[PDB]
Amino acid sequence: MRECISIHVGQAGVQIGNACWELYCLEHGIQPDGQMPDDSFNTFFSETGAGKHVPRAVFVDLEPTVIDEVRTGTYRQLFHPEQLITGKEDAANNYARGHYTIGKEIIDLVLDRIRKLADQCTGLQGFLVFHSFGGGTGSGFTSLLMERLSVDYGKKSKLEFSIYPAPQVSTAVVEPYNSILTTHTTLEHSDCAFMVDNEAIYDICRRNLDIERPTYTNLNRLISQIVSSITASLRFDGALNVDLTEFQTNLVPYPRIHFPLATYAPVISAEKQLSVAEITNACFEPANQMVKCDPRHGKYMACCLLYRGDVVPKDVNAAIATIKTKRSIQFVDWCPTGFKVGINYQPPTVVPGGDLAKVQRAVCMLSNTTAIAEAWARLDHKFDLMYAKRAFVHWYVGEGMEEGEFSEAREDMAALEKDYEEVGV
Amino acid sequence: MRECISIHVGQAGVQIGNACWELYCLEHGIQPDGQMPDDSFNTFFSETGAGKHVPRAVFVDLEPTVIDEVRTGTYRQLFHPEQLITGKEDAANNYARGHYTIGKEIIDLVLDRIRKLADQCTGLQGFLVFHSFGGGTGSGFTSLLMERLSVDYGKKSKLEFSIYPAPQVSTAVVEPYNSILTTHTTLEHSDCAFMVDNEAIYDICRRNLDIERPTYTNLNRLISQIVSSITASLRFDGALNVDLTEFQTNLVPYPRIHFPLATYAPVISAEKAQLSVAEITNACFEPANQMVKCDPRHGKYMACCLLYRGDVVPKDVNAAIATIKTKRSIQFVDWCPTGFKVGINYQPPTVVPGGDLAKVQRAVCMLSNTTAIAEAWARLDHKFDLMYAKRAFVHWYVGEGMEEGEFSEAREDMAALEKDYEEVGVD
Amino acid sequence: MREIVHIQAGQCGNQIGAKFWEVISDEHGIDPTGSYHGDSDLQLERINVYYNEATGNKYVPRAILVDLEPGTMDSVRSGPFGQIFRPDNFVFGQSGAGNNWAKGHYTEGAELVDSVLDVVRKESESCDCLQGFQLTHSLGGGTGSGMGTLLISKIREEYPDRIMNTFSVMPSPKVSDTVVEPYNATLSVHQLVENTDETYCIDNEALYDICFRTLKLTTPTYGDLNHLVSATMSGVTTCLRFPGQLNADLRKLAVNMVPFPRLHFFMPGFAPLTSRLTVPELTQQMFDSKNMMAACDPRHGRYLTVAAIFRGRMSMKEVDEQMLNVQNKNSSYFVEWIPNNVKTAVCDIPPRGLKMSATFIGNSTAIQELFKRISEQFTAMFRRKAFLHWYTGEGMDEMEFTEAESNMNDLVSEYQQYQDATA
Amino acid sequence: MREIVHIQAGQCGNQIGAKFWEVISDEHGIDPTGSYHGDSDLQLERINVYYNEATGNKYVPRAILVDLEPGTMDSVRSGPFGQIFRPDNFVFGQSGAGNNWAKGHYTEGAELVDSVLDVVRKESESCDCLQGFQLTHSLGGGTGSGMGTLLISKIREEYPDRIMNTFSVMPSPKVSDTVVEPYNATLSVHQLVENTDETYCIDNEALYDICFRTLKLTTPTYGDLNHLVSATMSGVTTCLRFPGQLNADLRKLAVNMVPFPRLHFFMPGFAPLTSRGSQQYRALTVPELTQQMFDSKNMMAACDPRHGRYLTVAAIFRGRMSMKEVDEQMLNVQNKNSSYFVEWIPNNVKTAVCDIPPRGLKMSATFIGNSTAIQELFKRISEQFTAMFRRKAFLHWYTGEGMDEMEFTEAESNMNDLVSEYQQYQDATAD
Amino acid sequence: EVIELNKATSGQSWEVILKPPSFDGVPPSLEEIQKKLEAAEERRKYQEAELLKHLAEKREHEREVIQKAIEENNNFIKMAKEKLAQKMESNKENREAHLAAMLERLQEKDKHAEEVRKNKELK
Ligand SMILES: Nc1nc2c(ncn2[C@@H]2O[C@H](COP(=O)(O)OP(=O)(O)OP(=O)(O)O)[C@@H](O)[C@H]2O)c(=O)[nH]1
């Protein structure tokens, strides 16, 4: 066995978790009551004495109405009360409150519930941690938790699914502060972090699903498809990325530069069959990335293609040939120019009645490109604008954070930028 | 709660008290025995277990003839005998006798009776002291009383309704002396003094009421309406109310500058065969309708308190006052960004049957602190100087123990008061 | 983070407070007998933020009614929704504040303040999770101003970790009640700088001007002004009271609206202006001085932060479009060093009598003008020491006056400093 | 301030005192037996000022009758109203003072004065609130002048806080040939300057002049002169005796009329002038009464008011008439005649009206002036005094009783000092 | 160049190499965390302690304002009382002195009278 434990922190983390676990249940045939008529799905689901299949998941959100979504939702019977951790007040958009005030209060309880899950594993691979950059809880508590997991599970892999802020849909002006604070503190404690730019997802739902104003459900159902593509060979007996350490092997040659660019296709409107070559071309169109950035402004370190559904290798290699001839895909020079390809035969699955159409074949490309540092630069600039005037800094300091943590986090991001530049030359 | 104690001193104070308490009774439906067939009349009337409503008042006079008329008059059962306090000999028009020789003989009894009235109050607001400037009791005994009230009650609010002398109706030539002496000694003990000029009240009774030779009862009934307009805010639950502290705060910019000018409108002849909220407001700034002879166009307003009663809606007061703010002939001091305080009580003014004042649907009484009232102090000071330059009559005061130093000290205080009115009018 | 404790102090405080409870009881479907009779469960999902639910399926406002004078609270009992308030939440003295800040803040208010705090504490103990306090009051009078700021301070000392929110009515010579309003207001502004987290500046100068100029009411009354206040108070509290994309609370409001602790004075604004309508037009009144409830021109300064609430049925994409279009065309009037400093919420529940409404909560450096106007009126009185003896008679030193105005002139300078700051 | 204690001393004092009591008794409805047979309670509201109420619903004058000569009170006892007086209040000696002030003041008068004080004490102690005393007397004789001023001094010692009022008849060579009357008058005036609060100057010179010139009495008798005195005394005591807008008393009179202690000698005036027991065929008009009041022909002191200035004036109009019209004429006579009123005592003329006229007249006016022209009276006495004293004429009449020349010099110095300060205030300016 | 990597029941994987690399080769304890959280808590508590200290200093000023007004009232009473006693005594003494002088003049006259009567007997 190769169990993975999922932890969802903050509202974004919990609601994206709802979407993924619903999608996992649809893919593995687990009913909402937890019953079910390849045994790889046990890496993500345990089984009780009643024969019910329970997600290896912990949900942490200090506002009870968010957690109430889980415990009164369609899949509520999947979850046991000990998996759901809530409080009185959330972090009020304040990283310092999430990390220090709430964090010191709830960290042992959260680690206790994680430990209970881990005790049920015989070959625990590690943790998949879902959270926002911009939320006070998603940023502040997640970073404390990652530190403590590094202490408590020293040899275990830790992957992140991180919601990168988009002001269009955010309600917090201080999200750039929270994003830099939590990136600095988490950097040394995560092995592989897949950022999801809310602006990128929003644009994909508008362009490819013809939705004027995409809901959080829209964004989250699209995010679930990416996560599902990434975890498919953990939950089925696939061939590529069959355990958590393989993600760092296949995508992260340098530890600090552990932020792969995900590209996904096809996204077809439900109210509306593409070839291997077409969906393969789409992986090299910036409009389908999960983070807004320009790969031409970078070099690749690693690139994997994860195919799902009716995909035959001759059709993939054909598609790759035609791209290399017509386009310049520049790898760093200490790295081979090439692709690791995996095909998972399990067909892409969509929520019935949702706005995603069911396709015969899909693909997710996971690439480590220095171009993703553009996303860091946009964040760092907004940080700099506000921090020069110490705007809002007193809310963080009022919660016990030292002002110098702003400067120390921001220097780290400067170093991250130069690390990306050095690697890209 | 919120009680006010009324003290009426000397002939003028007592006779005006007769007019006021009579009017209060008709306004509240209290019969001459204190029985009556809105709770706030209890600020002026305590109540016995028999249902008798007794004025929170003391009447004091050093001679018994005037208070004897109360003791044998229509309202002889309204008061308890112990509230009506008389000596044998009056002050013979001599401040020194009111304040010392004769007043000392009765002052402790008055303070004892006032303390018993205070003992019946759960939230005493303060004292309203009614007196003339010119009489020996009105001047000298009021001064003694005020000083004794400061000792007993500290800074507790003391306000005055004062009769400024008019030669036409006065029977004493030494009134300028008594006026200045009581003003000197009372200055630091009074919070606010509403001055009434008998001459102005006289001229209004002749002009507006077609009375050839107004009597004291004619003047007192008009003065009663003004007193009732002021105290109505404390006796009735109206829309806009003004309590004793709010009068002081909104009319007195400096401790010594505490003599607002009353004006009242409309004053209509009963026999003549309704004035608007704007009209009666405008009449309050007409120099003829003043209750003290002075010319406000000669000075600067420092505070205007307008007390409306009857059928008056707040909107119409707002429109009326907005016009007033546009009249360049109505000048306020540099240092007063806003000077208006408004009160509206909704019970119409009540007139005594058999009286000369017409019943009206609405009325207003304005209290204005104007630098022009300095003119009235100037007139009094000059009459004082004329006689005092010759020390005329001073021997009557010195014989009762006063010193000449008190005269000059009093007059110098009045000179400083005149200089104070000049100073607060500079830009 | 659920319950707000609302307090209303003094005459203005209780009049605009009562209108507030009138308006939002109607929106939430509560009659004056506390019984719910509404049509939608959007009206009850967050109704505990403002109402306690009693035994008989009835709702009682979490409201405490305070005055040193028994009169205006007697007239609130007699008012339309008078029977909805808990009878033991009326805490009233007898002898009034005499229009004197010193009386409400020191001697008279001290005599009543512990009675109020007992009622405040009984309400705070019946709260699952106390968000904080919402106080309505005037600054120009005696009780709301003097005793309200005393109440603020004592509440801060007993609940230092809860948010303090005020609706603070600013005086104007155009609609005054007492000659000492400049003293009362300046002494109170110093207290709010130090002790509140969020203050909506409700300016009687601007209310009067809106009624006279835009609404053609040649003689505005308090009823006319209070129709504007109650429309504003409904609009700014929308996201506290209804479920939506933004489920706001008073601490999130402070975190995102207040970049510097002293700079927590908001310019409210409302469209359409009405006496007792397109999306693009609604958006534009953000910069219209004619729609501001504080007598300040937003184009005289720069927005640090802005909150906009759109109410009614309308395209949230068209709203987001116009909001961004207004921000860019007016870029010179937002500070560049706070990116994305306007946030918009939409709520499908229109206010009564309107199909669509817009409400703006601005943290603008132009608010300094309101405080400069008070300062000048303070100084014109104080340089002549006019009426001062009524305050020193209460034990106050003259230095408290000079300290209060220099603090207010500092607030003005601080707002000017960020107005001029560049990226 | 209610009761007045009346004292009448010597022949003049008892004659004018008796006439006073006949006149005001008729005005209050008291018959010679003390019973009240009047028609108006106005007559009784303040009747206690001058009368005690006795046993049989009776009213007895609060009056003490004094004379060294025994026969003058037999004259009173048999005069009309002689029976009204308390019998115990007659205090009679054996021998008159022989027109000798020293006898009245130092010797014979001093032996009778303690007996007078007996009566004065019993009347005064029975008073609820004693205003003070009024004394009628002549200054030219020996008893009224000498024992009269001695009484004032002795009474003042026991009642120093009560007002001392006197009706003092000044001598005139036109009326009496007794050459030493300037001596008796000057010795008296000295005492009055120091020991009385208010003195009405009743000048026999004026009374004779009025009787001779205006009433065409070729040979006036004391009866003729006393008719003018009694009409004056009724008028000046009107506001003490009747209820009106001004309830006067002796102290409010003094305070308002006397700006300087020594200058308390009033010039009374009366209109109309009439002879005794004479029908008045037509009453007078208010402006007639008003101007005639300030006319030198109507003054009871032989002084022209236009020769000085009024410090203070009190005017009493009596009868049914317009108080509007009375104030109108009084304001008029003041404004046209502004030069005869000191400017530095503002509002120094006060007027009362009483609807009850004296008997025989439908309307009357009585004038009480504190005028500096009164110095003409004291200069007249002073000149007669000097014409004798420079010759030391008749001084042995006085040194025989124990006096010294120096007491004459001192009294003359004091009266000439009085004249000087009248002149001082006559010439004083408000500038 | 295609390199087969793995084959399984639910998928297969290989590596496609287009061009080989130019350059060969590649170029906090639990106690530390707990201390940092405890330090931040102590800074919160210090900041809160300092807030309450400022509010407590305001309470004491309020007590000092209220006390001061009570002292002003008390000293106003005390001075009014002192001065009134001073005036009434000085006035009493004055009036008694005037009366005593008036009687002493009258009594000097009384002795002069006895000297007049004595001079008469001497002659
Ligand atoms: N894709 C996606 N993003 C979300 C979702 N919910 C919130 N976000 C984004 O997450 C950021 C806010 O972070 P959250 O994690 O939801 O907030 P939180 O930390 O739980 O809340 P606080 O403790 O009050 O600060 C913003 O950028 C939101 O736009 C969601 O359901 N899906």
Ligand SMILES: Nc1nc2c(ncn2[C@@H]2O[C@H](COP(=O)(O)OP(=O)(O)OP(=O)(O)O)[C@@H](O)[C@H]2O)c(=O)[nH]1
């Ligand atoms: N308005 C009014 N004024 C009066 C009345 N009575 C007297 N005055 C005025 O009061 C002043 C005289 O003072 P009084 O009050 O009569 O005298 P007193 O206080 O009784 O003192 P004494 O009688 O001297 O002991 C004069 O100006 C009178 O005109 C009255 O009834 N009404």
Ligand SMILES: Nc1nc2c(ncn2[C@@H]2O[C@H](COP(=O)(O)OP(=O)(O)OP(=O)(O)O)[C@@H](O)[C@H]2O)c(=O)[nH]1
């Ligand atoms: N007007 C008036 N004057 C009188 C009358 N009787 C006397 N006189 C005047 O009084 C002065 C003389 O004094 P009298 O009163 O007769 O004397 P007396 O006081 O009785 O004292 P003796 O007779 O000397 O013991 C003279 O000036 C007389 O003219 C009178 O009845 N009327």
Ligand SMILES: Nc1nc2c(ncn2[C@@H]2O[C@H](COP(=O)(O)OP(=O)(O)O)[C@@H](O)[C@H]2O)c(=O)[nH]1
């Ligand atoms: N907008 C508005 N302002 C008011 C109202 N009542 C009073 N004010 C203002 O409040 C200030 C006077 O203070 P007030 O509340 O009445 O006195 P308090 O009872 O001592 O608090 C002045 O600026 C008045 O204009 C009202 O109902 N509405």
Ligand SMILES: CNc1nc2c(c(N3CC(=O)Nc4cc(OC)ccc43)n1)CCC2
């Ligand atoms: C309390 N009522 C309320 N209404 C609203 C908002 C709001 N807040 C709180 C919040 O959560 N975000 C936010 C971000 C922000 O950026 C500058 C400004 C203000 C707020 N609060 C935002 C729209 C309406």
Ligand SMILES: CNc1nc2c(c(N3CC(=O)Nc4cc(OC)ccc43)n1)CCC2
């Ligand atoms: C004794 N009979 C009497 N008659 C009268 C008066 C009068 N007094 C007393 C008083 O009260 N005022 C006054 C003021 C005054 O000013 C110059 C003059 C005189 C008096 N007394 C005045 C009218 C007639």
Ligand SMILES: [Mg+2]
């Ligand atoms: Mg009197």
